[PDB]
Structures are given as structure tokens and as C-alpha cells.
């Protein structure tokens, strides 16, 4: 591409990044609007870089193949030289932070439990003690492996049945964890970021409800390759965002609740 | 060359460093208990080192001096190199980034109002408005900084107030802040970290409370002098202890599980 442009990676996760109404006369960065989209916008004002936006190719977050030790996703784009910096809602990790350098976070979450509504269920702790609801977890990402190296008993057991469940528990995207929950009549939780959780939770047909507590206590960063020249200035930036009450700004407009749900 | 003790700098704040009971026989670590002295046994095991507990001589988390462009307290103490690690409840802020690293964070908070029970104040806006109850923060730290730099209309108005109130507003520590809202009747109220003031709240006399949302959002970090090589691994054992879910658990056991206001 052009010289001195950074090749931001990043992933179609509502509301993070999305195509715009009418994205297909459109071109460039301006296919695509969310937190993530302003997000880049400001990170690249305040660090005075070009960039362009692209979607991650393999659609996943990051995963290491247990036996090619190789890395997809947008972390592997990182790893590998595709792309120079990570715009998106990838979660900081132990396993990533070992190979991909992290901002200071820019949201908070923690992982949450999608019910239908109405799903006798309260806790992580009522799910790995019943079989009749089902649940699972998005591929190839930060919660998937939280509970595969989980040694905490009750994640420990929950893991231990959903990697035998069949059919599979676990989804490709998002929205399809989404819609098994609205579809399975309460017989499917799904197990995700309490960030699209409450995002889903406002918006129509108001069908599901995140209950309990978080069964964890993290946040995204933005990534870059290790060694990066980025990571300062971006660092830096995210935490004057961050203190200017910009990151809550964004937050608000993304998460705005027009009412679809109730009054509003 | 030969591995040496690392000099930890910390602050006497309940529960994160507290003296022991018999700590006037006691030398060295095991005179202080708390979050963050199992926290630094925690870490060290993890980094393979040994450490001295050091409470910082002026008591004070950090500023710089707006004249002198000096820093002082625990900030002050990584910066000129008086310790090597500062293992404290302090505070991730972008002044503080510029000349000192942080780890990812072990623990959130944003900046919260302290009451005493029963006083008429729900939110800081609330505060802003009327002028019978005083409020105010600790000096030489990131709340203070926070009201000072707001450009946020309510936050704004709530440090030209505070700046100029007399008799002054601002304590020295924490301590001084909750005994000036047990005392005050109503009349005085504190803006604290959400973390310290959900631990006053769990501490007899069982008399005052948190109100409101938090002000901000952000976290504390561990501290190394810019550059140390002692980062990467304090960093890498602060997520490793969370993922295994041992933050969780010391925040339990020094906020909750000996709590003295019930269940
Ligand atoms: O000070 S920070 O490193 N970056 C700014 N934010 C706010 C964006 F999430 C947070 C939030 C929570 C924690 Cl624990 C720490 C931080
Ligand atoms: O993943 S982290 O950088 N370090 C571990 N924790 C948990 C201890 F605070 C958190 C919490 C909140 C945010 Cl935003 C980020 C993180
Ligand atoms: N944010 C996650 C993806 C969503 C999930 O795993 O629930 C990640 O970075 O892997
Ligand atoms: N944690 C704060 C001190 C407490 C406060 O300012 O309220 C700091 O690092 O400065
Ligand atoms: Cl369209
Ligand atoms: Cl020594
Ligand atoms: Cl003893
Ligand atoms: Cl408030």
C-alpha cells in the first residue's frame, strides 16, 4: 500500500466496527462506523499517523494451533507481519501479551451469561450443575481459552463438559451464538464479553438478559507487534482519551439506548 | 552481576499495607500485612526475587511540583532512584506514564463520594450545587489531579470550589479523610477511590457509604523506573495471577472476608 499509511487490522463486531448503510458505494475507511472506527480516528490524530482499515481475513480474534504453534486472527496478523497495529475488541491476555505488545486497556469486561429471558439460570455455578441448558462459547477466542486453562472448579467443570457437547456448543461469530440462545426456547446459554452482552440486552427483539456477576475481570487493548514504534505514542494516547472522558463519550454513543427495549 | 534485593516502595493504606499486630518486635516484610504485601510475595515468586518492604518516607503517592517540576512520594522514590518496584494501590495516569512504567493493571477503581450515613447527596452534581456540605480530596495524588485538569463542567466547578475552600478541604491521608466525615455530622464529604471507600464501608462503626456512580474509570498498577527489565515479568505475573483468579481472592480476603459490618 502507500508509504507511511499504518495497516490498522480489526474485526465486524457490533458495535465496534460495522458496515454502513450503503457501505457499497463506499470506499476506504469509510465503509465502516463504530467505537472502534472513532476509536482509530483519534488514537491516529493524537500519534499523527495515515492508516487504513482492515478486516481481519480469517474473521478471528486470535488463537495458538496447539500443534503448529501458529497464530490466526488478528493476533496472527500482528505476529506475522499483515497488518502494524490492532483496532478492535481484542482482549489482553497472559498467552498474547507473551507475544503481541498491548495499549493500557481502553474498555473494561468481564466474561458474562447470556440467558433467553426467563431461563432458570443465575449463576455459572447453576449451569455446571444442570445438563438440560446447554451452553458454549465463540471459537477461537479469549473466552473459549479462558475455560480450557481454567483450574477454578466450576470453570473447570463447565469446560470439561462443553468440549464434549454434541453437537458443537461452540460458534463461528457472534451473532450466531446470539441467535441460538433466541432460538433454543432458553435451552442454550451463551457464554460471552459483557460489553456485547449488554450491547444485545437493549437492543430488539429484547429477548435475552445477562445474569449474575462476571466470572472474570479484564479489558481490550490495542495491539501492536512486539518491538513496535507505535506502542508508546498510542499507549499515551489511549490513557489521555481515557482521562479527557472521551473513551466514556464513545462508549455512551454506541451503547446509546434509543429505547427498543421498554421506555428508554 | 549478582542478584540484589529489590527495594519495593509502598504506603501505609488499610488493607493494602498495614502494621502488624506485634510489628514493634518485628523486622523487615513481617511487619506489615495486607493486599499488597501477599501481592509482592505473589510476584516475586513468580519474577524469582527477593524484596524489602519499604514504606515511603513522605507518605505520599506522587506529584510533581508545578515549580520545581520535583517528584514526590512513591512516584518520586522510582523516578530517582530510591526503589526499584513500587507495589501500592497507585493510580495509572497519563503524567505518571510519561516518566515511570506501569504494569497492566491488578486492580479498577474510579474516583467515588464517601458519606456519612443519611447525608443528602447522591451524585457529584449533587455536591456541585449546594454549599453546606464541604468536600474535598487527598493531597499529592490522582484524584486531586483529576479535579484540577477536568475540563468537565460539573468537575470543573467542583475544583474552584475546592481549591479556594476555607478551612481547607484536603487531608494528608485517607485516614484523616473518613475520620473528617464520621466527625463533620453530615457536613463534610469525601472523594475517594472506590476501592478504599467500598473497604471503609466494611470497617466499624459502620457509618458511612458510597454514593453514586464512580467519577471515573481506571486501575493501579505496578511501577518500575522507566525502562527497568524487571517490567516484563511483573507484568506477565500481575495477568497470570488474575487469569488463575488469585486477585479476586485477595481482594476477598482483605475487603470482605473479615469484613466487621455483617454478611
Ligand atoms: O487506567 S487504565 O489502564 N486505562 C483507562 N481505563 C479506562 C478504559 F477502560 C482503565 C479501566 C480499568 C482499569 Cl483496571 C484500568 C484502566
Ligand atoms: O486484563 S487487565 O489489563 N489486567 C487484569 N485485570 C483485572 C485486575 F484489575 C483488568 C481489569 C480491568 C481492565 Cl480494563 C483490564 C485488566
Ligand atoms: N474479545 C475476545 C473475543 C470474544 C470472546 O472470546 O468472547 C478476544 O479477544 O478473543
Ligand atoms: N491511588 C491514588 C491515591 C488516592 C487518591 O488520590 O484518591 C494515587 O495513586 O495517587
Ligand atoms: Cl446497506
Ligand atoms: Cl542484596
Ligand atoms: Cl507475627
Ligand atoms: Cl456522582
Known amino acids: 500500500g502507500a508509504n507511511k499509511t499504518v495497516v490498522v487490522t480489526t474485526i465486524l463486531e457490533s458495535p465496534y466496527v460495522m458496515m454502513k448503510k450503503n457501505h457499497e458505494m463506499l470506499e476506504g475507511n469509510e465503509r ?43 493476533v496472527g496478523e500482528l505476529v506475522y507481519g499483515k497488518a502494524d497495529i490492532a483496532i478492535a475488541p481484542l482482549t489482553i491476555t497472559y498467552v498474547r501479551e507473551e507475544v503481541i505488545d498491548f495499549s493500557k486497556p481502553f474498555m473494561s469486561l468481564g466474561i458474562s451469561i447470556m440467558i433467553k429471558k426467563g431461563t432458570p439460570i443465575e449463576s455459572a455455578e447453576d449451569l455446571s450443575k444442570q445438563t438440560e441448558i446447554a451452553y458454549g462459547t465463540l471459537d477461537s477466542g479469549s473466552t473459549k481459552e479462558f475455560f480450557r486453562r481454567s483450574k477454578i472448579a466450576v470453570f473447570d467443570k463447565m469446560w470439561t463438559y462443553m ?41 430488539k427483539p429484547c429477548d435475552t438478559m445477562k445474569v449474575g456477576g462476571n466470572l472474570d475481570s479484564k479489558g481490550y487493548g490495542i495491539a501492536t507487534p512486539k518491538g513496535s514504534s507505535l506502542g508508546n505514542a498510542v499507549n499515551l494516547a489511549v490513557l489521555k482519551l481515557s482521562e479527557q472522558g472521551l473513551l466514556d463519550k464513545l462508549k455512551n454513543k454506541w451503547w446509546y439506548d434509543k429505547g427498543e427495549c421498554g421506555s428508554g
Open 32 to 74: 465502516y462506523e463504530g467505537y472502534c472506527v472513532d476509536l482509530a480516528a483519534e488514537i491516529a490524530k493524537h500519534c499523527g499517523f495515515k492508516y487504513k482499515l482492515t478486516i481481519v481475513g480469517d474473521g478471528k480474534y486470535g488463537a495458538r494451533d496447539a500443534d503448529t504453534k501458529i497464530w490466526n486472527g488478528m
Open 163 to 203: 468440549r464434549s457437547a454434541e453437537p458443537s456448543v461452540f460458534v463461528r461469530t457472534t451473532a450466531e451464538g446470539v441467535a441460538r440462545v433466541r432460538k433454543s426456547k432458553g435451552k442454550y446459554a451463551y457464554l460471552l464479553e459483557s460489553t456485547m452482552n449488554e450491547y444485545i440486552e437493549q437492543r
